[PDB]
C-alpha cells in the first residue's frame, strides 16, 4: 500500500498561504488528472481530542512560548488593527517577521502540515502503508522556537519524532536545494537519527549552514557525533553529477545503518525552472535526479515517508511530484504506471502552457573529496555505535 | 405521549461496536432502574420487506456505492486483499470508522431506531420520542467519520421534512460540529441546521468555525442563511452555556416556526467526559442540558431526541435519565422525582465510587460571545429575508431585552 | 503526642522579615524558657526532592507565574541597584508592594511556612502527631496571584488541600482579627472544606469581606454553598462575650459536619493590648477567649493543626502562644503543666519588661441575629450534603 | 597502594538499610566483575576491642546521648516493642524520624561505615595505601546531636579527624555529592586545619538549605573563618561547565593550603539519571565525566587521599560510576592501563543493567548569562583571607598561571 495525505479542509489550509498559493492544488490535481488516485491510499490529516492534546504534540519539538507566539501572530492577523509594538517586539523574538509573515490562517496553515506528516508516520507504524506521501509537508527550516524560511512549524521533526519513538533507527534524507537545517539541529545530539541533506552552499546563500564552517565541517555532538552528513554542490549542476554524488552516499547510509524508516524530504527547487536557477534538475523519466533518488531509496524496501518542501515554480513542481508519485506507486505495487506524455485536461490544465506537456520545459573532484571525506564520518560514526559493517563493500561503492 | 426507541435486539446491536461498547445497556437500564419505562411508549426499530427497500431507505441520502462497501466490510469481518484495502481507505473504511464483525448492521440499527422514531412523530403517535442509540451526525454521503458509519440523523430529517411549508429545525449539542447534518442540508431552506460545539486548531473536525477578514459560512444557493453556528473556547460552565444558545434558540423558534424539532443531545460536554473541555454537568435543583431541553420542550413543537458522543458511559447515563426525567415531566405534566441515589440494578457497580446519580464534579468581562449573538441574529434576519417570512423584531427584541441585550437584534 | 514546628534554619527564616523581625524567636524561646520543649515532638519543615517538586507543592493552590513574580521579587531585592519600570508592573500585578514589599529573603520567607504547615499536615497524616503547632505559619489572605496583608504564600490552604487529599471533611476555624478571605476563598466551591471566620468587621477596615454584602450574607457557591461561615463583631469585645459568641458555633460545626481534621488559625490580635486596640480579649488562664476556644476545639479529639497568624505587640503574642501551647500538652498527654506567673530568665526576657508577668498588662443581641442565622446556614447545608443531624440538639447549644 | 574498604560481613550491614537497598553490593559485585578487585589492597573495617572503645572513637565526634538514643532505636526495632511516648519524644528531639527512620540493624548500619572509614584513614596515616576507597561511607550530613538525610553517624567527620591529628598537619575535603556536604562543614567549622569546600545544588526548599548566600556567604568563624567554602550552581549543570567550574578552584586550593590528605565525597545523585533529576553528569570515559576528571585531577597532586561515597538513587548508575571511578584510581596511582569493556560483564546482578547492559549510563547529552565568574572571584579572595589569617605563602603568581590557562588570570587577587 501506498498512502497520500489529503482531504477537502487540508487542501484548503495548505492553499491559505501568502508564499506557496495554490501550489498543493495543482500538485493533487495533476497527480488527480493522472488516474493515479485509485492506486493510492488516503491517510486523512491527524485530527486531536483537545487543545492540550494538540499542544502536547507540537511542544514534543516547539517551545510552548512559541506555540502560543504563533497562535497569537494568528489572532491578531484575523483582527483589521495593526499590532502594537509590544507585540511587534514579541514576533520579532521568534522571527514571526520578514520571511515569515503573518497572514489570517498562519497557525493553521502551519499546523495542517504537521497533522498530515504526523498521520503519514502513523500509517508507516501500524504498517497500513509501507509509503506515505505527504506533498503539504516537509518544512525542514523552523527550529525550536523560531520560523524560518517560511516554515513555521517543523513537521519533518515531529513526524521523524514520532517513527523513532515506536533499536529504531531513521535515516533523513534532504533533496530539497537548500540545508535542511532545523531537521539537523533537533537530531543533532542523536545517533538514533541520521540526516543528510545534498544542497547548493555558497556565501550569503540562504540558510547558511551545510558547509565548512582551516575551516572544519562540523557533524554531530554528543552521543549524535559524525550523525549529521553534508554534501554542498556548486551551482550548475545537472542531473548526471547530481545523481553520481548523491548516489553512492544513499546506498552506504543504507548498508551502514539499516534504518528501520526512510524520512526523504523532496524540495523540487533543484529543478533547472525553478525561479532560484540554481541546479539543472529535471522532471524526466526517459533520468531526473530526483527519481534516481527515490528509486534508489524505494529499492531498499525499508517504510519510507515522501514529502514536499521548496518549489516555486508551481506547475513544474507538480510535473515533478506527479511523477514521483507514480514511480513510488509503480516500484511498490509492482504495478506498471502508463503516464500521457500531455498534461491531461482538469482544472488548471491553463496552467501547464503553453505547451502542456509533462516533461519541464529544459534543454541541458570536488565532490571526490567530499566523498573521502564522508566515508571517514560514516566509519567513524559506525565506530562509535559498534556498528558492524563490510569497509571493503562500502568503499567500493565509489 | 412520550416514545422511546428500544428492543431487545436492537440493544444487543446497539451494544456490538468496539468504540461504545454497552453504552446503550447502561442508559436503557438506568432508565428502568429508576422506574421510567412505564412512563413511556416504546417505539419499535422499522424494519422492512426486503434488502431492497431497505437499501432504499439508506441510499436516500447515502450513496449505493458506500452502502455496498459497508455490507462488503462487514461480511469480510465475519471471515483483505490489497483492493479491498484500498476500497475500504476510498471511503475512510478505515482508523476512527474501522470494521469490526456486526459494523453494518450496528449502522442500521440506528437508522431503523431514528426512522421508527420519525414515524412516530409523523403519525402523532407520540409528542416527542427519544433514540439513545442514534444521534451519528458525522456520517457523510459516501464517507465514514468519527465512528459514524450512515447518518441516522439526515435519514429521520429527511422523512419529517417529506411528510405533508414544513420545516425542521436542528439542534446539536454535542461537543462537535455536526458536519455531517449541516452538509447535506447545506443547499436546503426548509431544514435549519444549528450546531454549538468546541472548535479550535486541529480539534475534530474543523469546521463549523470561522473561514481580508475572516467570515461564517452559512448555506448556499436556495440554503444561503441556513446553517447556524456558535464555536465557543474549552472550558465553559452549565450558566454561560445556558446564556450563550437560550436566547438563540427561541429566535430560531420564533422565525423559523419549525414543524418539528430534532436535538442531537451527545454528552461529551460533560465535566467528567474524557474529552475535558466544557464542564457542563447533570444537576437538577442547573445543567445546561436540562435547561435548553426544557426550553425546546416548552415550544410544543413535536420533537425527535437523539444521542451521540459522550465517553464516560455511566455519566452519559446519569444525563440521558435525567434528560428521560425531565421530557416525561414536560411532555406529560407529571413529576418524575429521581433518588440522588443510584438504584439497584445490574449495573449498579459502574457508578462508583460514590453510586449517586449527579456526576462527580465540583464546579468552581473578557471571555462572552455578544458579537456572535449579533451575526447569528443577523444571520437570522436575511435568512428570514431570502424566504420570504415573518421576522418579527418586537418578539425577538423582547426575548434579548430580558438579559439587557434587545441592541444586539437587528430591526 | 503534639508536636511543634522548628528548626534553626526556619528559625532564621521565620525572623528576617521587616514586618514580623524577631517574633517566632521571642515565642519559641518564651515556650523553651518554659521547659515545654521536651513535652513536644519536633516537626521539620518539609524540603523537596528538586526545584520541580517545590514548585508542584506550591502551585497546588498558587499560580506558577505569581510564584515566578515572588521569587523574582527576592532576587531583585538580592541586587544593590533598582527594579525597572516593567519589573514594578510586573510586581504590581500581583500586588507585591505596598502591604506585600519585596525584601531580600522573601520568597525564603514565604516558603518557609508552606514548608512547616505541609510537614505538619503530613504528621497528622500518617498519625505521628494528634495535634501540631506551626507558630511561623497562618498567612490566611494570600490568594492563587496575590499578595495580601503581608501574606506571599498561603500555607493554609496548602495545608489543608493536602488534608482533605489523604470521606474526608476539614473544618477550618480563624480566630485571627481580621477575616480570612483567602482560606475562604480557596474552598469557596469545596463543601469538604467548611471555613468558619470570626473578625472585626467595619467600613474601611482590612480586608473588607466577611460581612453583610438588604445586604446579604454570601456563603459559598455551586457545591461549596453554605460552607463558608462568618462571624464579624463589633469593636471592643471582650473574652466572655467573644468566647460566648463563638461557643455555639464551634460546638455546633463540630456535631454536624464531624470533622476529620481541624485546622485552627491562632492570630493573636484581638488581644486588648495589640497595636490595632480593637479587640480586649486576654491570655489569662484562672478566662481567654482564645484558650477557651482552643479547648473546646481539642475535646473534640480530632486531630488538630494549631497555626499561628497576626499579632504585633510581639511579648505579648509571645505570651498567648506560650500558654496555648501549654494548654495543648496538657489537653492532649493529660499531664498538668505548671506555669509560673513570671517569666523566666532566657535570652529575650528583658523584652517582657516592665513588670516581667506572663499575664499580659490590662485591666478588664446583634451575635443573636447572627447565631439564628449561623443555625440556618448550618441546616442548609447539612441537608445540602445529606447529613444527618438532629434539630434539636444542635439548636439547644443556644 | 590502591586500598578498597571491603569484607563479607561489612557488605551484609552496608546492604541492610530500607533506603539504600543493596546498592553496595552492586557496586562491589560491578567493580570484582570487571576484574578489579586483584589491583586492590582490601582494607578491613576497623573493629574494637571493647564496647567502651567503641563509644569512645565515636564520641570523637557525636554526643553520649545521641549515642545512647541511636543504640536503642535499635534496641526498640529488634522486638515487638512499639515505642512508649516518651521513647517517641526521645528518638524525635535527634530527629531519628521521618528521613531516618529506626529499622532492626540502624546502628550497625551507621557503625559499619564509620569502621570503614577509620580503618581507610589508618591505611593513608601508616603510608599503608596511597588512596582508600570506601563506598560503604561519605555520609556527610550526620551532625552533632542528630540524624539527618538517612545520615545516622559521620563517618567523614571521624575519618577526618583521626587524619588530622596524625603526626602543621592539613586536611582537604572536597564533597561532590548533589548536596551541602553540610554535616563536615559544621564539624570544622572553627577548625583552620580541615579547610572544606562543597560543590552542589542550591535553590530554595532544596535540602538541606545550606551552602549558599545568607546577602553574603558565610565561611566559617573565629580561627576557622574563611576555611568554609561553597560553590551553589543552579540545576541542569553538564560535565564539562562543572568540571570547569570546581576544577580551577580545586588546583587553586591545593596551591595554597598544601594539605597532607585529601578526603574525597564522591556521591552519584548529579549524574543525569539520578531520579534527583538536576544536574546532567555521566559517567562517560572517551565529552568526559565530571566526577572522573575531579577524580583524576586531585590524584595528580600525588596527596594520600580517601575516596567516599554517598548520595546515589539509581544503584546501577552509581555502580557504573563508581567502578569507573575505581579503575580511574587504580590506572592514576599504579600507572597500569584498565580497560574496561562496555558490556557489562557476566556476573549475579547482570539482570540489573538492562536493557542495555552497557556501562555507559543511558543518557543523551544535549544543549553568555549561566557563568559563575563572580563565585570564582569571590572564591579566590576568601581563599587569599585563609592564607592571610594563618600565616600561610599566597603565592599569586602560580594561581594566575592557572587561571590565565583559562584567559581568567584577571580573576585572582594579588
Ligand atoms: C529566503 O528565501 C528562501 C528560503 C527558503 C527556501 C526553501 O525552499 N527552503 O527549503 C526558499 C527561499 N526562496 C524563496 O522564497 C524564493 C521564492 C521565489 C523566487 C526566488 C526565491
Ligand atoms: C475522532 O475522535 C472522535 C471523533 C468523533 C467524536 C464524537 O463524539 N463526535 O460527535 C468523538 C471522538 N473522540 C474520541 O474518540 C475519544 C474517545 C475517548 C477519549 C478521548 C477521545
Ligand atoms: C493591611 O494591614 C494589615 C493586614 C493584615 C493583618 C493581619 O494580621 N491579618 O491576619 C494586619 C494588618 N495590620 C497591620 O499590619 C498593622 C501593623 C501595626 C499596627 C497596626 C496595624
Ligand atoms: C531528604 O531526602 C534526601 C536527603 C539527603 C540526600 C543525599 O543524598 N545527601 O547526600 C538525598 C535525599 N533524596 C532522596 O531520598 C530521594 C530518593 C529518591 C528519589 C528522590 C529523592
Ligand atoms: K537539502
Ligand atoms: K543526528
Ligand atoms: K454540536
Ligand atoms: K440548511
Ligand atoms: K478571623
Ligand atoms: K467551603
Ligand atoms: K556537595
Ligand atoms: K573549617
Ligand atoms: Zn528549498
Ligand atoms: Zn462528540
Ligand atoms: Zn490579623
Ligand atoms: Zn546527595
Known amino acids: 500500500s501506498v498512502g497520500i495525505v489529503y482531504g477537502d479542509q487540508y487542501r484548503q489550509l495548505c492553499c491559505s498561504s501568502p508564499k506557496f498559493g495554490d501550489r498543493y492544488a495543482l500538485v493533487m490535481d495533476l497527480i488527480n488528472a493522472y488516474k493515479l488516485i485509485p492506486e493510492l491510499s488516503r491517510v486523512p490529516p491527524l485530527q486531536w481530542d483537545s487543545p492540550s492534546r494538540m499542544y502536547e504534540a507540537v511542544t514534543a519539538f516547539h517551545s510552548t512560548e512559541y506555540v502560543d507566539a504563533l497562535k497569537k501572530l494568528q489572532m491578531l492577523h484575523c483582527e483589521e488593527k495593526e ?3 509590544d507585540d511587534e517586539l514579541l514576533m520579532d523574538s521568534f522571527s514571526l517577521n520578514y520571511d515569515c ?13 504537521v497533522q498530515g506528516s504526523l498521520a503519514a508516520a502513523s500509517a508507516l507504524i501500524c504498517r497500513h502503508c509501507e ?3 505527504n506533498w503539504g509537508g516537509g518544512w525542514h527550516h523552523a527550529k525550536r522556537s523560531e520560523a524560518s524560511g517560511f516554515c513555521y512549524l517543523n513537521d519533518i521533526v515531529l513526524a521523524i519524532h514520532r517513527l523513532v519513538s ?3 533507527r531513521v535515516l533523513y534524507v534532504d533533496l530539497d536545494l537548500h540545508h535542511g537545517d532545523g531537521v539537523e539541529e533537533a537530531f543533532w545530539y542523536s545517533p538514533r537519527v541520521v540526516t543528510f541533506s545534498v544542497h547548493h552552499a555558497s556565501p550569503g546563500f540562504f540558510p547558511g549552514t551545510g558547509t565548512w564552517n582551516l575551516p572544519i565541517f562540523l557533524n554531530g555532538a554528543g552521543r549524535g557525533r559524525f550523525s549529521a552528513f553534508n554534501l554542498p554542490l556548486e551551482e550548475g549542476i545537472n542531473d548526471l553529477d547530481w545523481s553520481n554524488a548523491i548516489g553512492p552516499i544513499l546506498d552506504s547510509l543504507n548498508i551502514v545503518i539499516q534504518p528501520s524508516y526512510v524520512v526523504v524530504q523532496c524540495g523540487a527547487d533543484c529543478l533547472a525552472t525553478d525561479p532560484h536557477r540554481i541546479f539543472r534538475l529535471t522532471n524526466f523519466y526517459p533520468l531526473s535526479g530526483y527519481l534516481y533518488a527515490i528509486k534508489k531509496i524505494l529499492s531498499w524496501k525499508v517504510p519510507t515517508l515522501i514529502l514536499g518542501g521548496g518549489g516555486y515554480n508551481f506547475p513544474d513542481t507538480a510535473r515533478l511530484w506527479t511523477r514521483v508519485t507514480a514511480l513510488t506507486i509503480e516500484e511498490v505495487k509492482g504495478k506498471k504506471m502508463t503516464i500521457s506524455p500531455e498534461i491531461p485536461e482538469h482544472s488548471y490544465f491553463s496552467r501547464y502552457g503553453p505547451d502542456f506537456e509533462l516533461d519541464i520545459d529544459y534543454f541541458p573532484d570536488s565532490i571526490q573529496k567530499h566523498h573521502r571525506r564522508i566515508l571517514e564520518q560514516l566509519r567513524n560514526y559506525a565506530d562509535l555505535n559498534k556498528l558492524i559493517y563490510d569497509y571493503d563493500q562500502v568503499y567500493q561503492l565509489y
Open 83 to 85: 499590532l502594537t509594538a
Open 101 to 113: 509573515p503573518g497572514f489570517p490562517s498562519v497557525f493553521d496553515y502551519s499546523l495542517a502540515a
Open 131 to 133: 509509503v506515505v506521501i
Open 166 to 168: 515506536s533499536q529504531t
